[PDB]
Amino acid sequence: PRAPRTYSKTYSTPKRPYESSRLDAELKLAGEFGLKNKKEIYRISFQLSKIRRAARDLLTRDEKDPKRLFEGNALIRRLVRVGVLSEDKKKLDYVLALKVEDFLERRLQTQVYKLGLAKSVHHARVLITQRHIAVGKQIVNIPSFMVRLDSEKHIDFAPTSPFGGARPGRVARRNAARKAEASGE
Amino acid sequence: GISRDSRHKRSATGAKRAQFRKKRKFELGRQPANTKIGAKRIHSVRTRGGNKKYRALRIETGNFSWASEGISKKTRIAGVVYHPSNNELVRTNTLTKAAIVQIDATPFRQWFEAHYGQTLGKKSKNAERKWAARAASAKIESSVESQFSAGRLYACISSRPGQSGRCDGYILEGEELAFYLRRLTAKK
């Protein structure tokens, strides 16, 4: 009789699986973002579709409708804050035109590459999932972390590890210690 | 035990409905105590929520009321005579409501003659004071007086003896007296 802890699934998988063209467009997006599996492409097209459908039934409401007012403007304000909808495209009509590369662009992986710090999307992830890209004080190792517009400027190497701070790795710190008996006693 | 539920019955369409659940105490019923004349015996029933019903088993001698006089004295209750539901109660002389019994008339005769001063149906100077005032109200009925000649009066039990434990009633008067008279003579 425990309280019924809820949940949901984050993705929607495509109807027609074998389409010869769509397969390619996804493969590119996997490379020109640096994604693990095709599920990380699905996760976003599902997010976008619910985002779109939200705006879809929102523009059906004749204007100056509080639902088209309060809700429609509570979307944009969230949609710009992450850097997806550009600083001002802001409209219910410009979210419907908003495509899949826009969210993917704002991922912590696709940022950590963007400004310095990485010089690869594969170096980016490997950097993220291993400890240190940390945003601010807190380490965030999620390659999907979704950098917000103004959280951008706070992202640099972390207070720990050879890249941002105290001590180098114990790969090298083991290398300096094996010449300790070689070049020492 | 007996069940007061309506779901052992049939639907107004006539259908017979399956037994939906068991019997529960709150829908129960219990056995009649058929109360007949005799030396007073009254059994207690432990009702719903505690409390008490009082079973009349043997009932003699309970309270009765002369309507028009506004006075009530206790008398014997000889037996039953009529009863609208079941003559079986008449024959068996059982006491219930609507009974139409017969009661001792004498304590009802005494009050009258010590009040209105006229003997019924044929010093102390303070008394003739009172009896003077109370006259001109001193005619009762031809039908209500005649029973005092016999010594027993026509009375109707208004209590629920098996419930309260008291068996009480009121002497028959008016057309209600006439109604049960036209029964007793034109039935028995």
Binding site: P1, R2, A3, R5, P66, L69, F70 | -
Partner: protein, 260 residues
């Protein structure tokens, strides 16, 4: 189902307690009170979940069993005791007092009133009848029965009630344009005045209302509590004073005082 039900399940509790889904299967199940446990505050909710003074189930008892809390002038030992509308809840060692009044979302609000204004309470007279010997009597929303009352008092009034003793200090009748707090409903927790009382023979009279900002709305007569004279309550209302600011209006006020 064979008798009285001695348990309450979390998710079956009143919503206005604002309990969290997890942390247990059960709520306190308020005791048998002056107030219906439907609409009521168990002491544990107030102390532990609102005043945040107690951290435990065992800790709330350590307070009460330390004799600390009283309610409506009298000390209350019961963990689940159902403090309802217009109550008092004095804590000497904390020097505070609280009159329980509803939010504009409809929850019991945490509302401190001073060492006075906790003297008296208001209550709605539910019925006025003849008792034994001819003695007339009157009883409030919280089940206070007060004897030999004012012949003017009828049902649907309010009564100002001294605590340490009892009885009746004046009162307020029910007619056009009186101050009213809404006891429960869609509009519960609001405050306003009487635009009209729609009479209905055989139950459920509609009471029209207007607030300080000139909004109209209706609820049930049984949930209409007279709190005083128009623009002047007889007790101290909290922030917003039951004004029902629109959801859109809310957003601004939150992003108004939010800055620098």
């Amino acid at each position: 189902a064979r008798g009285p039900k001695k348990h309450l399940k979390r998710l079956a509790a009143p919503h206005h307690w604002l309990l969290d889904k997890l942390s247990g299967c059960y709520a306190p199940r308020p005791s048998a009170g002056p107030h219906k446990l439907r609409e009521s505050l168990p002491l544990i909710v107030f102390l532990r979940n609102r005043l945040k003074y107690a951290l435990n189930g065992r800790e709330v008892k350590a307070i009460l069993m330390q004799r600390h809390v009283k309610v409506d002038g009298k000390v209350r030992t019961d963990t689940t005791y159902p403090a309802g509308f217009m109550d008092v809840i004095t804590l000497d060692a904390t020097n505070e007092n609280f009159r329980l009044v509803y939010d504009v979302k409809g929850r019991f609000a945490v509302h401190r009133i001073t060492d006075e204004e906790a003297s008296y309470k208001l209550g709605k007279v539910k019925k006025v009848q003849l008792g034994k010997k001819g003695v007339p009597y009157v009883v409030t929303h919280d089940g206070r029965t007060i004897r030999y009352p004012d012949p003017n008092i009828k049902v649907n009034d309010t009564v100002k009630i001294d605590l340490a003793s009892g009885k009746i200090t004046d009162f307020i009748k029910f007619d056009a344009g009186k101050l009213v707090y809404v006891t429960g409903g869609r509009n519960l927790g609001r405050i306003g005045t009487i635009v009209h009382k729609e009479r209905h023979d055989g139950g459920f009279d509609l009471v029209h209302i207007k607030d300080s900002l000139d909004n109209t709305f209706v609820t049930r007569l049984n949930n209409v509590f007279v709190i005083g004279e128009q623009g002047k309550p007889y007790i101290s209302l909290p922030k917003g004073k039951g004004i029902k600011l629109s959801i859109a209006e809310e957003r601004d006020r939150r992003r108004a005082q939010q800055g620098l």
